[PDB]
C-alpha cells in the first residue's frame, strides 16, 4: 500500500493549508513543533478525521480509499490504551476475537496470536500481567509493544503511530524503534508522528515530512533533510541533533517564508509530477457481547481493590447501623427511629451511586478508539459494559444491607416484606446509577459531573419527604416532588413497613382514636406524609422507578450514539 | 563564593558513594540519569537535605558551611512557586518585605526591586498580573524569570537551580539560560541540575558533574566530558547530543565499571589535590503576620471563581429554602418543618466545610520552600493563612443564610434569637473547618484527605439527633454523641427556636397536657430529644464548640511544626 495526499485542507482558520506527497513502503515520519500539524495530519491520513474539511483525494494505489478502510487499517494510539487488569495474552485474544473472521477455528486464531507474540518479542512475557498501579506491572516498553501488538493481528499493510515515544525514558525508545524497523523490513508502510527525536532514531528514516504551523515546510526522503537546509543558506554545525536543529529553525535559527521557499525546491516538482502521473460488520451481535462482557467481568474482578472496598464499607456500615438501631421499639421513638433508618438507607444508595461516574468517563478514550477502529457497535458495547459492571456491583449491597440490618433492627417479620424491601433497595440503586450514567455519559471530565450529581441528589433529598412535609408546599412548586428518586424509594419502604404497626402503649387507636394529634398508628403517619394505603400505592413507586431506569438508560445510549467520535 | 564538597555520603541504601570537587565562580551544572545524584547532590549542597545522613564535609571558602547559609543563598525551585493572582511587582514586593531588613525604608526596598526588575528583563510586565488558570497568564518563561527574581532581592552569592528548563519550549529555555549566564558573569556562582539539554545550552557551561546511580562518573570542565569519554575507548558520531551521548553511555551504547574508571584519571587527582590543600527572627511577629495576611487577601480577591461561587450558591440556597419552607405554620407539620430546616442548615455548614481541604494542601510546596528559605515562622504563617483565607470566608454564608431565611420562613422574631442563630451557625462552620484543617494539615493528596472527612461527617450526621433518638441508644455506644459537631449546632438551634411554642391549634397545653402522646409544645419536643431547658443548656453547646476549635487548631499547628520539612 502506497498512500498519497494532494491539496488536503482541513477546516474546523485552516489548520492544514496544502499538503502533497506519496508514502512508499518503508519507515516514514511526520515531525513538527507542537504548534505545527503533527497531531492532525495523521488523523487526516488515517481517516480518523471528519471528511467535511478535507478536499484532496487521499488515494491508495490509485483506488480512492473505500469505506472499509478503517477496519482494514491499524492506528496505534499516542499513549497506551491496554487494560492493566488482564494479562498480555488476554489482551491479544480480546483483540483477535472481534477483528478476525468467525468462520475460522480457534486453532488458526491462537496460531496467529502465537506468531504475533513470538515475533514481537513478548513471548518471554506472554502470560505476565500487563499491570495496573496497584499490582506490579510490566515494563513500559512491553506495554507499548502490547499496544503495537493489538493491531498486527488483522495483518494490515499500513500502520499509523501517533507519538510512540512520548512517555518513555530514552532507554526503551531505541528498542521500540528497532522493533518498528524490523517490522518494516517485510513490507509494511509505517507512518508515525514524533516529538523531538534523537539521532539514534532519525538515522533509519525513509521519508521526512515537516509540518511547521499548518504548512508543509518539507516532504521528501529523510536522509536529504540536512542537505535541504545547508543548500538554503544556513550552516551545518556539529554535535547537534539535526531534528532539534529543524525544530530550532522554526524558532529563530518567517513561517510564511520557508513555506513559500519549499514549493521552489525540486522535492516538490518531482513528486508533483509523479502524482500527476499516478492520477493519470465482521462479527455477530451475541459474539460482540460475549467478549465485551467477558473482558469487563475480568477487569472488575481483576481489580479487587474498588469492589472489595465497596463490599467491606457496606458490611461495616450495615453492622454499625444495626448496632445503633438494634431493637426498634413500638413507642414514641419508634416512628422517628424507623423513619430515620429508612431515610438513611434510601439516601445511602443514592449518594453512593455517585461512583458510577467512572464507568464511561474513565473509559471514554478506549471506547472511542475501539469503536472507530471497528471492533463492535455502540449497542453491543453498552450492553456488554452494563451487564458486567452494574448488574454484579449494585446488586450486592442491596442484598447485604437487607440481610444484615433487617433482623438486627427488627423490621416486619414476614416472608414477602423482606423481599419487597430488598427489591425496592435494588431498584433505587439501579435508578440512581442510570441517572448518574445519563448525566455522565460522553463527558470527558469527572469533576463537573460529580458536582451536578451532588446538587441533584441534595435537591431530591430535600424533596424526599422527611425534611419538609410534601403536603405543605405551595402548589406552584409541589410538582417538583415527582422528579426525585429518593422519594419513590422512601415511599415504598415506608409503605412496606409502617402499615400494620402501633406506637402508643396501652392505646388501641384502630377503633376510635381519642385526643387527636397523637399519631398513634402507622396509617395515620402514612397519610400525614401524603401516601396511598392501597397495593397500587406501594407498586406505583416501583413502576415509576422502572420508567426512570428506562428513560435514563435511553438518554445514556443516545448520548453515546451521537458523541463526537472524530 | 567557592563551595567545596568532599567525601559526601547519604543514606535513609547509601545513595552517594563518594563525591569530590569544588564549584568555582562561573556557570556550572550537574547532569545525568534520573537515578544518579542529580536531584540529590544539589539538594545536599544547598543544605535542604536532612543533615543526619551527610558523612562528608561541605565548605564555603574553606570555613565550614555557616548557619545563615539558607538565608544567604538562593535556591530557585524547579517548577513555579509564585502566586498566580498576585502581580510580578507584588510578588517581588512580598518576597522583599519579609527577607530584607525592616530598618531600611520602603524607598530603598523599591529601588532594589527596580534594579532587580531591570536585570530580570521584566520592565514591560511588572504592572500586569502573572496569571492563573482562569485569568490570561503571562508566558511561562516570564513566570520562571519572576520566580528567579524573587530570590535576587536579598542579593545572595550562591544561586541554586534545579531543572530550570523543564516545562518550556526550545527557544525559551535558551532565553532562560542566556539570562542565567548574564547573571553568572557577576561572580554569582550558579549551580543547577540540568536534564537532557540540546548542545546549544551545553556550550555555555564552566564545570560539570555526571552522576549515574549514585556515583561520580565525571567531574570537571564541561568542555572535557566528550574528551574524557573519547580517550577511554569510545567513539562519538556527529549530529549526536553530547548530553544524550552520555545518557546513552550510561546504558551501554556497567555502572560499577564506569564508576571506577574515573578514580584513575587526572580529573580526580587534581580535584582531590586542590581539596586536600584547601582542607589541609529577622522580622517582628507582627511584620510577619501583616504581610502574610495581606498577600493571602490580595490572592483571594484575585480569585473570582471560588469566592463568587460560594456567595452565589449561598444566596441561591437561601432563596430556594425560603421558598420551599415559606411561612412555617404552628400545626402538626410545624415541628417536622422546623426540625428539617434547622437540620438542613447545620448539615449544610458541615458538608460545605469539606471544601477547605485545599488550604494547607495545595500550597504545601511553597510553604516548605519559603520556610526553609527563612521567610517567616510557622506560627506567623499559620495565623496569616488562617485570618484571611478562612476567617472572612466562613462568616459570609452564616450571615446570608440567617438574614435571608429568617423572615421568609418566619422564625422567632426577636432581636437576640436572630443573633444567637447567626452566632451558632458561624461557630459550627468554624468548628467543622478546624476539623477539616486538623485532618488535611500535612497531606500531599486531596482524595485520601476528603474520604475520611466525608466518612466522619456521615457518622456525625447519624449521631446528630434527627435520624435516631439519642436517648434510645445502648450505653456501651451512647457516649459517642459527644464527638459530633452537627449535634451541638443542631441542639443550640433547636433550643433557641423551639422554646416558647404551641403546635396544637385549640389546645393550650402549657399547664395540664390532656391526653399525653400529643407533643403540643416546644418544651415537650425538646425534652423528648434530650436537650436542656435552662440557659446553660444553650451555651454548653457553644463552649464545647469553641473548645473543639481550639483543640483542633492546636492539632493542625502541631502537624505543621513536626512536619518533615527536610
Amino acid at each position: 500500500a502506497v498512500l498519497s495526499f494532494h491539496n488536503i485542507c482541513y477546516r474546523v482558520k485552516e489548520i492544514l493549508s496544502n499538503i502533497n506527497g506519496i508514502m512508499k513502503p518503508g519507515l516514514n515520519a511526520i515531525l513538527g513543533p507542537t504548534g505545527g500539524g503533527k497531531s492532525s495530519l495523521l488523523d487526516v491520513l488515517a481517516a480518523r478525521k471528519d471528511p467535511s474539511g478535507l478536499s484532496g483525494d487521499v488515494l491508495i494505489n490509485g483506488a480512492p480509499r473505500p469505506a472499509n478502510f478503517k477496519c482494514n487499517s491499524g492506528y496505534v494510539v499516542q499513549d497506551d490504551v491496554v487494560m492493566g487488569t488482564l494479562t498480555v495474552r488476554e489482551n491479544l485474544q480480546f483483540s483477535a476475537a472481534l477483528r478476525l473472521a468467525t468462520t475460522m477455528t480457534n486453532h488458526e486464531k491462537n496460531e496467529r496470536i502465537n506468531r504475533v507474540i513470538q515475533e514481537l518479542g513478548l513471548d518471554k512475557v506472554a502470560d505476565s500481567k500487563v499491570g495496573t498501579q496497584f499490582i506490579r506491572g510490566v515494563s513500559g516498553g512491553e506495554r507499548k509493544r502490547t499496544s503495537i501488538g493489538m493491531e498486527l493481528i488483522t495483518d494490515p499493510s499500513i500502520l499509523f503511530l501517533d507519538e510512540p515515544t512520548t512517555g518513555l525514558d530514552s532507554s526503551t525508545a531505541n528498542a521500540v524503534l528497532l522493533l518498528l524497523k524490523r517490522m518494516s523490513k517485510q513490507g509494511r508502510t509505517i507512518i508515525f508522528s514524533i516529538h523531538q527525536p534523537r539521532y539514534s532514531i532519525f538515522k533509519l528514516f525513509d521519508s521526512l515530512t515537516l509540518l511547521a504551523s499548518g504548512r508543509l515546510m518539507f516532504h521528501g526522503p529523510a536522509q536529504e533533510a540536512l542537505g535541504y537546509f545547508e543548500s538554503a543558506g544556513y550552516h551545518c554545525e556539529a554535535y547537534n541533533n539535526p531534528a532539534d536543529f529543524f525544530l530550532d529553525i522554526i524558532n529563530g535559527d518567517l513561517i510564511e517564508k520557508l513555506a513559500e521557499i519549499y514549493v521552489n525546491s525540486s522535492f516538490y516538482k518531482e513528486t508533483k509530477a509523479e502524482l500527476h502521473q499516478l492520477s493519470g460488520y465482521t462479527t455477530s451481535f451475541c459474539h460482540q457481547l460475549r467478549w465485551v462482557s467477558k473482558r469487563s467481568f475480568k477487569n472488575l474482578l481483576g481489580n479487587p481493590q474498588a469492589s472489595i472496598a465497596q463490599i467491606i464499607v457496606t458490611v461495616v456500615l450495615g453492622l454499625v447501623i444495626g448496632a445503633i438501631y438494634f431493637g426498634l421499639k413500638n413507642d414514641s421513638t419508634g416512628i422517628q427511629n424507623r423513619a430515620g433508618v429508612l431515610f438513611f438507607l434510601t439516601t445511602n444508595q443514592c449518594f453512593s451511586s455517585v461512583s458510577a461516574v467512572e464507568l464511561f468517563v474513565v473509559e471514554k478514550k478506549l471506547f472511542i478508539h475501539e469503536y472507530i477502529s471497528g471492533y463492535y457497535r455502540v449497542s453491543s458495547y453498552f450492553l456488554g459494559k452494563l451487564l458486567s459492571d452494574l448488574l454484579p456491583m449494585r446488586m450486592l449491597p442491596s442484598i447485604i444491607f437487607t440481610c444484615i440490618v433487617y433482623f438486627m433492627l427488627g423490621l416486619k417479620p414476614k416472608a414477602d416484606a423482606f423481599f419487597v424491601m430488598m427489591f425496592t433497595l435494588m431498584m433505587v440503586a439501579y435508578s440512581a446509577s442510570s441517572m448518574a450514567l445519563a448525566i455522565a455519559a460522553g463527558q470527558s471530565v469527572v469533576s463537573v459531573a460529580t458536582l451536578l450529581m451532588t446538587i441533584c441528589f441534595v435537591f431530591m433529598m430535600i424533596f424526599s419527604g422527611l425534611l419538609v412535609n410534601l403536603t405543605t408546599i405551595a402548589s406552584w412548586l409541589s410538582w417538583l416532588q415527582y422528579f426525585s428518586i429518593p422519594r419513590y424509594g422512601f415511599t415504598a419502604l415506608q409503605h412496606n413497613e409502617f402499615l400494620g404497626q402501633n406506637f402508643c402503649p396501652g392505646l388501641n387507636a384502630t377503633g376510635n382514636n381519642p385526643c387527636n394529634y397523637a399519631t398513634c398508628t402507622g396509617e395515620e403517619y402514612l397519610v400525614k406524609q401524603g401516601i396511598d394505603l392501597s397495593p397500587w400505592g406501594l407498586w406505583k413507586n416501583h413502576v415509576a422507578l422502572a420508567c426512570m431506569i428506562v428513560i435514563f438508560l435511553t438518554i445514556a445510549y443516545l448520548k453515546l450514539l451521537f458523541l463526537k467520535k472524530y | 563564593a567557592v563551595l567545596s564538597f568532599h567525601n559526601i555520603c547519604y543514606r535513609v541504601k547509601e545513595i552517594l558513594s563518594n563525591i569530590n570537587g569544588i564549584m568555582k565562580p562561573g556557570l556550572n551544572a550537574i547532569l545525568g540519569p534520573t537515578g544518579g545524584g542529580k536531584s540529590s547532590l544539589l539538594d545536599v549542597l544547598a543544605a535542604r537535605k536532612d543533615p543526619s545522613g551527610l558523612s562528608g564535609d561541605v565548605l564555603i571558602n574553606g570555613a565550614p558551611r555557616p548557619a545563615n547559609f539558607k538565608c544567604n543563598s538562593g535556591y530557585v525551585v524547579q517548577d513555579d512557586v509564585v502566586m498566580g493572582t498576585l502581580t510580578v511587582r507584588e510578588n517581588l514586593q512580598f518576597s522583599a518585605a519579609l527577607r530584607l531588613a525592616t530598618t531600611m525604608t520602603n524607598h530603598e526596598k523599591n529601588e532594589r526591586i527596580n534594579r532587580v526588575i531591570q536585570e530580570l528583563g521584566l520592565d514591560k510586565v511588572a504592572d500586569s498580573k502573572v496569571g492563573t488558570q482562569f485569568i490570561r497568564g503571562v508566558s511561562g518563561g516570564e513566570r520562571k524569570r519572576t520566580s528567579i527574581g524573587m530570590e535576587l532581592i536579598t542579593d545572595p552569592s550562591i544561586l541554586f537551580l534545579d531543572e530550570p528548563t523543564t516545562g518550556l519550549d526550545s527557544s525559551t529555555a535558551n532565553a532562560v539560560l542566556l539570562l542565567l549566564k548574564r547573571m553568572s558573569k557577576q561572580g554569582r556562582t550558579i549551580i543547577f541540575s540540568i536534564h537532557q539539554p540540546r548542545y546549544s545550552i551545553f556550550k555555555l557551561f564552566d564545570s560539570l558533574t555526571l552522576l549515574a546511580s549514585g556515583r561520580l562518573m565525571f567531574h570537571g570542565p564541561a568542555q572535557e566530558a566528550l574528551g574524557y569519554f573519547e580517550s577511554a575507548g569510545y567513539h562519538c558520531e556527529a549530529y549526536n547530543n553530547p548530553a544524550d551521548f552520555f545518557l546513552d553511555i550510561i546504558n551501554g551504547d556497567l555502572i560499577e565499571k564506569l564508576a571506577e574508571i574515573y578514580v584513575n584519571s587526572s580529573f580526580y587527582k587534581e580535584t582531590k589535590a586542590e581539596l586536600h590543600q584547601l582542607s589541609g527572627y529577622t522580622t517582628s511577629f507582627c511584620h510577619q503576620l501583616r504581610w502574610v495576611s495581606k498577600r493571602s487577601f490580595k490572592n483571594l480577591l484575585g480569585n473570582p471563581q471560588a469566592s463568587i461561587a460560594q456567595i452565589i450558591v449561598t444566596v441561591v440556597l437561601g432563596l430556594v429554602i425560603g421558598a420551599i419552607y415559606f411561612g412555617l405554620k404552628n400545626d402538626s407539620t410545624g415541628i417536622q418543618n422546623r426540625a428539617g430546616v434547622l437540620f438542613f442548615l447545620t448539615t449544610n455548614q458541615c458538608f460545605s466545610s469539606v471544601s477547605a481541604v485545599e488550604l494547607f494542601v495545595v500550597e504545601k510546596k511553597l510553604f516548605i520552600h519559603e520556610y526553609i528559605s527563612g521567610y517567616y515562622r510557622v506560627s506567623s504563617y499559620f495565623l496569616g493563612k488562617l485570618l484571611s483565607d478562612l476567617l472572612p470566608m466562613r462568616m459570609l454564608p452564616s450571615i446570608i443564610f440567617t438574614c435571608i431565611v429568617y423572615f421568609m420562613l418566619g422564625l422567632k422574631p426577636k432581636a437576640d434569637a436572630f443573633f444567637v442563630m447567626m452566632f451558632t451557625l458561624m461557630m459550627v462552620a468554624y468548628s467543622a473547618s478546624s476539623m477539616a484543617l486538623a485532618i488535611a494539615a500535612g497531606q500531599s493528596v486531596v482524595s485520601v484527605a476528603t474520604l475520611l472527612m466525608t466518612i466522619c461527617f456521615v457518622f456525625m450526621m447519624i449521631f446528630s439527633g434527627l435520624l435516631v433518638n439519642l436517648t434510645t441508644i445502648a450505653s456501651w455506644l451512647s457516649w459517642l454523641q459527644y464527638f459530633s459537631i452537627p449535634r451541638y449546632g443542631f441542639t443550640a438551634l433547636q433550643h433557641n427556636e423551639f422554646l416558647g411554642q404551641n403546635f396544637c391549634p385549640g389546645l393550650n397545653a402549657t399547664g395540664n397536657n390532656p391526653c399525653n402522646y400529643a407533643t403540643c409544645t416546644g418544651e415537650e419536643y425538646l425534652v423528648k430529644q434530650g436537650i436542656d431547658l435552662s440557659p446553660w443548656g444553650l451555651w454548653k453547646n457553644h463552649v464545647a464548640l469553641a473548645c473543639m476549635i481550639v483543640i483542633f487548631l492546636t492539632i493542625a499547628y502541631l502537624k505543621l511544626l513536626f512536619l518533615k520539612k527536610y
Partner: antibody
Amino acid sequence: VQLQESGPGLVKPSQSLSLTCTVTGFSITSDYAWNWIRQFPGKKLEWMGYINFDGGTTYNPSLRGRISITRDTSKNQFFLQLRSVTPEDTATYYCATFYGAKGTLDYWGQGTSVTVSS
Amino acid sequence: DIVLTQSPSSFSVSLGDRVTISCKASGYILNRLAWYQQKPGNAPRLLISGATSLETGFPSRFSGTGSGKDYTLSISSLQTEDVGTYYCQQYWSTPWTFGGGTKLEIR
C-alpha cells in the same frame, strides 16, 4: 361558653363588612380556637378561618387577602373584617368554637343574615 | 382539599324505618369525620364525632360506621324529631370541608 353576634345586616357592594361577637362564660385567651362559618342561600356551608387562643390566625385559602379576624382580649370579643364585598356574600355567619383535643366544632353562635346589595 | 360527597342529596322514608346516609370522601380521612344535624332556622348541632362516637343529648339510635374513604350515618327507626339536613364534616386537613347535606323528608 356562649357567643353573640352583631353587625350591619346590609352592606353596599365593593366595600367592607365588619361583624363582632361577644364570648360570655369563657376567656378567649384561655383555651380554644374561634372561627367563622358562613351558610349560603341553598344551605351550603363554608369555614372561613379562626383565631387561636394565643393570637395566631388561619383562613380559608379561597379568601386570600379578603378576610381578617382580630381580637379584643380586654372585653372578650373577636371580629370578622371581610373587605371588597360582593353580592354573592349573602349568608349567615354563626361564629363557632373549636376545641382541638376532640377536633369538632363544639359550640355555635346564633347566626345573623348579612345581605349585600345596593 | 378533601371534598366530601353525600351522593343521596335527598331521602324519603316513613316513620320507624331504618335509613343510612353515605359520605364518601376524596381522601383518607382516618375517622376524622363528624356528623352535624341542622334544623330549620337554627345553627348546626354536632351529632357524631370521630365517625363512631356519639355526643350527649342524643339517643343511641344514631350510629356511625365507616373506614377509609367511606363512612355512613345510620338512623334506625327514625322518629318525628329526625327530619332536617345532615352535613358530614372532615377535620383532618387544614380547610375543614362540609358535605352537601341530605335534606330528609317524610311520607
